[model samples]
Structure formats: C-alpha cells, structure tokens
Target: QMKEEDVLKFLAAGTHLGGTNLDFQMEQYIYKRKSDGIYIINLKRTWEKLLLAARAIVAIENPADVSVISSRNTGQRAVLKFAAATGATPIAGRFTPGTFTNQIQAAFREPRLLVVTDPRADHQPLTEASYVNLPTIALCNTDSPLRYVDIAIPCNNKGAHSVGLMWWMLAREVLRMRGTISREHPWEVMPDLYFYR
Candidate 1:
C-alpha cells in the first residue's frame, strides 16, 4: 500500500527529525527523543495532519486561487515544483511587503488560500493572510509559531530533504484527491525532483 511506502519515504528522508528546540505547544507532535537531544516527531501525526492540509488544499474550487509561498531558499524548489504539479500559485522568492494587504502595491494579490513552507521564514505573508481572512496552511517545524497557521503540518522544515519530501508528498496527495493521478499506482514524479539542489 502507498500508505506503508509513505512511512518508508518519510524515514529515509529524515522527515521525522526535529530540532532540539521545542515549542511548548508543539509537545503533542513529538514522538520521542534521540540520545543527542534532537526531537523525533510523531510521523503518525504528521501523516494525519498532512491529510488534513491536503483536504483543505483540494477544497478550493480553483487551485490557482491558492497561493503557496516560500521565503526560505531551502524550500524554494519544492514550493515551485508543488505549484507546477498542483496548479496553485507559487511565490517562490522574496515575499514583498504589502503584497497581500497593499492594494496600491504592484504585487498586490487576492489569493483565497495560503500555504507556506515555514511559518517562521514566511511569517509576514502568513500574518497578512490572517489580516485578509485568507485560510492558511503551513509546513512547520516543532519550534514554529502557530499564531496564524490554521492547518499546521508539523515536520522537519529545517532540513532541505525533509522539506522537499513533505512538499512532494503534499502535492502528490492533492493530485490524488483530484484524480489527476491514480492511487493504485505510484506517482510518476520522483521525490528527488522536489529536493533542493
């Protein structure tokens, strides 16, 4: 089953790995600890929240109305690949100030949904999404702030491989839910393509 394969992929990429710093509210997501002190995230919860985020992502009538952003270069490629695969709008580079709130600003946009690679790295837009009443989802590390992220997919957003794997899986799940790809078969796109070079 793809479900079992998903766990294997998560492990190989170290997606369950988390930083030593843990947010008090993030304790629910941690599975255990390593001898070196790094936190091991509960992959069970990660998988569940990922499905929740995917459900939220596909609920949008038009995928283009969803804006996926990444301020951290670590996830830039994955974010772009996700946009390309799922047809959502991607803001892969610098998130200009007022892009969401400033109607007069040249980059001003009215996207209905917001998905970001990291809550901390892309806080400005996440905060702006809240101001605009735009529903938001984010790939968050254990220490990421949860103030504005409506559906926080907890994972190791700090590592390039981990971020890329999470994005790839999310994109695949969205496509599967839309029937663009058959769940009976593996996705044609490999996880490496989403990895940051």
Candidate 2:
C-alpha cells in the first residue's frame, strides 16, 4: 500500500510548475479571485468524469477523427477524457509562447471541437481561432470570459466534482447523439459508487 505522505506528494506532484518562479504565483493565488463564486470540483469527481468519457468514446460506432489540445493548467483531465472517449489523439499543449505551434497545428486536423479548460487561455494564441465561439468547450471559472466557448460550464478550482460531472454528462450526451445508447457503463456496471454517487 501507499503511505499518507506518499499520496499527498502524488497529488501535489500532479500540479504543474512552469518554472522556479513560485513567489509571484503563490501571491496571486492568495490575493486573486480569478472567477466568480463557481462550484469547486474535487479530484474524485474529475476522475469519474474521465472514466465516463473514456467509456463513451470507447463505444463510438463510427468514431469520428478528432483531436484534443489542453493547457498546462488544465493539464491532462480534459484532453485525457476527450481523447479516450473519442479515440482521438491529444496534442501537446496550447499554441502559446513556450509551446511549439507546429505540434498544435498538426494535432488539430479538423477544427471541430476545441476544449479549453485552462483559465489562463482567456487571451492567448489559441484564442486567435476566428470561430472560437462556434466550436469550443471551456471549463470556465468566474474569471472566464464567455466569448471563447460555445459550451461554457463554469467551475471553481476547488476540486473536480462540478467539472467532472459536467464533462461526463456532456460526453454521454454526445455519444447518445450518434445513436449509441449505453448509460450502463461506469456508474451502473459494478453497482459500486465510490464517493460521488
């Protein structure tokens, strides 16, 4: 088994560190309220959603070719879920200063559904997409601008419950759209509800 400290360290490590400049970020998080009073999602919720997305994508009859691009902040949650669900490949990162544009451009062969979960992507290179509002799914917070995403489900950075639930539901719905009805995958398969029942 794993120790308590080990689990804590793992959770902490999941968070990305851009560089050694931690002072500014710590201060900003302490003093800044990026978004409005949005619901905070827990880690458990996020994991559940990813699982559901994976199930939904795995069930795709004629899986359409799709690509996913996520930010360092959003990390792998959205991309992981989307890619697994749709059987699509994941791009490295958003087309930003430090990231390479060629990789991003290559991943997104068809400009269909672009999921932007990072709040920092409010004003960046990816925002340059002219039809942003037309084809985008954003896990928005209070500070998130609504101009970017067509489907904006706002959430606080508390945990992954809210966002996770939303993603799972949305992915399931999308799957249903393509005429594959199977709501008995994750939640009802084993008759085991972990925490978010």
Candidate 3:
C-alpha cells in the first residue's frame, strides 16, 4: 500500500489537477476548486481508484488478455512501458477503427480488458470496447466522460509526468499482486523512463 505522504508526491506533481471542462461523472472525485478554475481531484480517491483498477488488472487470466491504448502523444511512452512491464498488448498512436470491433479487419485483436490513457482522445477504442462488451479502465482527467469506462483513475491525464506516474504505479502494483515482486523489495521502474519528452 502507498503511504499517504508518498501518495502526496502525485498531488505535488499536479496529477490531481483537472481542466475547467469538468464532467458530471467526474465531479465525485473533485476535492475542491482551484483559484485558476481548475478542479482538483481528491488525492485519496485517486489512490483508491488506482488500487481498485490494479486489482482488476491482476485478476486477468493472462496478461495477453489485456490491451493498453494511448492515442495522445503524451501518453504513448507510459502506455508502451506499461505493456512492456506487464506483457499486455500496447496500441499507440491512431487506433485503427476496426481493430477490436470487426474480427475480419486486418488488425483485429480481442482483449478481455481495454485500458486507455484518455477516453476522450481514444474514443475509437472506447467505442470498440463498448461494442464488444469488453471491460474498460481509463486514466481520466476532469474533462473525460465515463459513460463507457468501467473503472477510472482520475488524474491529470494530459501531463507527461502524471501519465508516467499513473502507469508506473499500476505496473508496480500489478507486479506485486502477481507475486512477481516481493513486498520487501519490489522492482521499480524509473518514472523518467516513461515520461514523454
């Protein structure tokens, strides 16, 4: 479990800050209003949701059964690193429309769970996931809609550091849950490695 002070680092990095375009579904995560009109997601809730999403990810029967998608340039590094760390499939850049929806399509691949960096930017993946009834987990900012996502980790999904930190935390927790790393000395990936340049 992450200590409160350790979790505070994410907040310090502005992970919980969201844009003014707040979604009604996301209001639950907001802690308070910022002077600049940005809404701040509750740090405690962000941590809770991260753990919940991690648990769901760890419950997958096979790592290949998961697919991580990031359409935003800022999210690509973290998504790729996450796939590498977890052995899950990664789809970076523009997501082909038929990838998950139409099996006959060239890039067809069916994953049990669909993880997205930002649902707003990765709309096609979310649409395909919804069409196929695949469960979805997303790193959502205040502006993101939650209609199609089953799990959401509220954070500053637009920031390079925030995205890196979110994926890094998920990877570490998933490894721990899978028994691949010991509690005393779990493996750690440098956050800078996943940061978008």
Tens-place lDDT digits, model 2, residues 60-179: 444553445555533346455645665565653656552323334544444444555554553453464433322554554434555654444433322344333344444554554444
Q: Native-vs-model 3 lDDT?
A: 0.86
TM-score of 3: 0.92
**CA lDDT of 184 in candidate 1?**
81
Per-residue lDDT over 41-155 for candidate 1, one digit per residue giving the tens place of the 0 to 100 score: 9998899888899999899888899999999888899999999999999999899998888766345356978999999989999999888788899987888898998998889
CA RMSD of each candidate after superposition: 2.5, 11.1, 2.5
Order the candidates by lDDT, highest first.
Answer: 1, 3, 2
Q: Which run of 10 residues does model 2 get worst, by summed lDDT?
A: 188-197
Clashing pairs in 1: none
Residue 158 displacement in candidate 2 (angstroms): 5.8
Backbone clashes in each candidate structure, one number apiece?
A: 0, 10, 0
Q: Of the candidates shown, which would achieve the greatest TM-score relative to the real structure?
A: 1
Relative to the unseen true structure, what is the C-alpha lDDT of residue 53 in candidate 1, on a scale of 0 to 100? Answer: 92
lDDT of 1: 0.89
Tens digits of per-residue lDDT for model 3 on 60-134? Answer: 888988999898898898889999999999999989888877776344346989999998899899988898888
Clashes of 1: 0
- Give the Cα lDDT of each candidate: 0.89, 0.41, 0.86
Which stretches of model 1 miss by more than 4 angstroms? 104-109
Clash-forming residue pairs, model 3: none
